[PDB]
Symmetry: D2
Subunit: 237 residues, 4 copies
């Protein structure tokens, strides 16, 4: 069904499906079983920042995740996105909880995409930046349990009145406008995304994670993708 390319900030190690034995960042190409992962020293209750970059010349998707006053974690994977995704896609953020839980709060999100053609000065670009989310954010498609406006933040998964995260929750937010990632005369296509998040859990074992993803424009949450599937995949294959 959906074609998904995602960078996961996986908080819970599901060693039975290929996760390493610790929280990690990974690059998922059409499967929850990451093509590449890196140990991530996740900090419960602290605001982190993720940066994702890619360009069609190098064909390498890279991500860096950091917390203030700490060393960052980085993961890269050689992949030609032209061979994986359609030329028009939507970009978004996804998150889930299962038996274990955590808040999956997004405080800001920016994205820039550029397509430079062989025509002199021919540059097509799209850029958006959210540092504040309102209750009625018309330029975002919210799916599942995702809501905006609470403290000006985007809550990807269910959080009750008292601020407590709920289990078995899944939610995604996609930018309204389709994004053009390939064009026949483009000499270089590139994108960069940045988002800050706050993962907090009253438990010693938070779950399940947050993911930045790129999909077919009509992507929807697959049935039963709560928990380990991050609201992105229908199964663990």
């Amino acid at each position: 069904a959906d074609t998904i390319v995602a960078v996961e900030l996986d908080t819970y190690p599901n060693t039975d499906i290929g996760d390493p034995s610790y929280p990690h960042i990974g690059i998922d190409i059409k499967s929850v079983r990451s093509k590449k992962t890196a140990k991530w020293n996740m900090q419960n209750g602290k605001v982190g920042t993720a940066h994702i970059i890619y360009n069609s010349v190098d064909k390498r998707l890279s991500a860096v995740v950091s917390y203030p006053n700490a060393d960052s974690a980085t993961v890269s994977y050689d992949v030609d996105l032209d061979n994986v995704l359609p030329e028009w896609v939507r970009v978004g953020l996804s998150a889930s909880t299962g038996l274990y839980k955590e808040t999956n709060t997004i405080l800001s999100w920016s994205f820039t995409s550029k397509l430079k053609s062989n025509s002199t000065h021919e540059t097509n670009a799209l850029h958006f930046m959210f540092n504040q989310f309102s209750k009625d954010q018309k330029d975002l498609i919210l799916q599942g349990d995702a809501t905006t406006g609470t403290d000006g933040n985007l809550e990807l998964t269910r959080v009750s009145s008292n601020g407590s995260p709920q289990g078995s929750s899944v939610g995604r937010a996609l930018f309204y406008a389709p994004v053009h990632i390939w064009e026949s005369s483009a000499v270089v296509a590139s994108f960069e995304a940045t988002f800050t998040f706050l993962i907090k859990s009253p438990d010693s074992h938070p779950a399940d994670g947050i993911a930045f993803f790129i999909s077919n424009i009509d992507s929807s949450i697959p049935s039963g993708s709560t928990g380990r599937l991050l609201g992105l995949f229908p199964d663990a294959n």
Copy 2:
């Protein structure tokens, strides 16, 4: 019905509805009868550039139109857009022909909108730039006779195979994503738009013009808005 704020590049003087006796640029606030106009030395067959700027502190909508090697024309109007438009709008380009005609070709179009909140570093932004249009431009809503792809350009009104402009034509192109122009905690909201166009006509009297506009998100071409109504207004009041 629709709420329209537009900057018109009016090529045909309809003196019976308030147009001055020459091609002109004007600022239209909910009516085709411009609140302010300026003489425009239109050049048949030459590529021109229009710049439109506005900010919520000054509350002045200004536009500058120029052609290479020539003096520009500028028009400004004091207007508080918060009092005219809804907080969420769509932006676009419109054009028409009637008994007289011209090509209403758009070669490039960029737009930037910013909302700066009272929160330290709280900036929400949207920016798009098209220097090339493809046949299937999924991030544009095309209405009426508007088409993309021909020579990588956006043709707002009907042009036949041989490049000849057709009469009684009307077309508009709006950016797919809604644009947020007001927010309760914004201290300054601003936008700037730029587009280059090519108006060419085999006749001594081309018509009718091109307009950059901002409207309610669900705006559609009003019935019978070809010709002098620029595909924006239902009547000449």
Copy 3:
């Protein structure tokens, strides 16, 4: 000597030289006696944000100052900068203390300048953004007591080891590269600046203020411009 255009965040009311009886924001055109002022509810110890905007079509210099959770203050003044400043200028921040004192800490500073020519797509631009300052910031010219690096901030005036602000201090920081604000074929020139600051004082009467300024490229701190003269003017005329 120097030609100065500045937006002052004046913390001390020197009613003898024209200041109103309260902290205020003002627009200074070649004189410390502001052409226009607005009451400013200054908050000792809180981080504020100032936004300054201007364009050559409207010829209006406007500034907005705000603190989180508070209403902002705004001041505007109609002035054609082409008639006041040379075509090449330097932009910077200045601050001073006198018998009364305060810290004049800058946490971030961004500036964007654009010159759009009548040539199709002819845009010249300069943009810089500092969200962190290092000890050896080679792209800034520091004058007087200004230093960078302390906590990644820019300290415009002298602050001793224990964090206490010192009196009779003056310092300025200018961006290294000259900025082009006028060009014979420009149809529109514009700029926008934003900076966040932290003014803190152990006294009930802090002084003297911070100013964003634009000057001739070779501008230097005038002799005896500590205190009420904000490190910008040689006298109070």
Copy 4:
């Protein structure tokens, strides 16, 4: 002496110093003998566009050169610039002619550099764009025979009144402000440069080429670097 990293658009094959037998694009790390090259189908008299990109996560310097209606050429090289260049550098364009000649005209030049720190939202950036050059371009350091203003272009090497390129010429233009490419707390540093050029020669064998380069801030044209040395290297080692 100078530390140079450059992307050369080499028009003349000096097979005696390692050039392949055809015009080519190459990546030079402290030596004119390119670490990597790619065949370049140079078009005499046509305006081309070069794009150069790099980021500290991937540590790969890549360049793409294209002409309208033609396939592009691309070259990449894995190199960690932190290990080659100082933390503060200047960026520029260089060109030369020798016994053979060509015009080395630059029509536009843009550059963007970003340093993202581990602090939430800590981004330092520098961006400049020249689409028009004036006679007195104060934000550029011109070395050798380089001049600005002629037709609003930057002429890197000597061209006589009649538009004819002169031999044994060398010239460079560097942006005035130093550029910060490394900082202890940066999690990702990146830059992208784009320039359009016009190489024209009345001869069948034009020479010698144009290069985008990054150097120590105080870099100057090495003695005798006309011709094959591109105004960048003191010798052919």
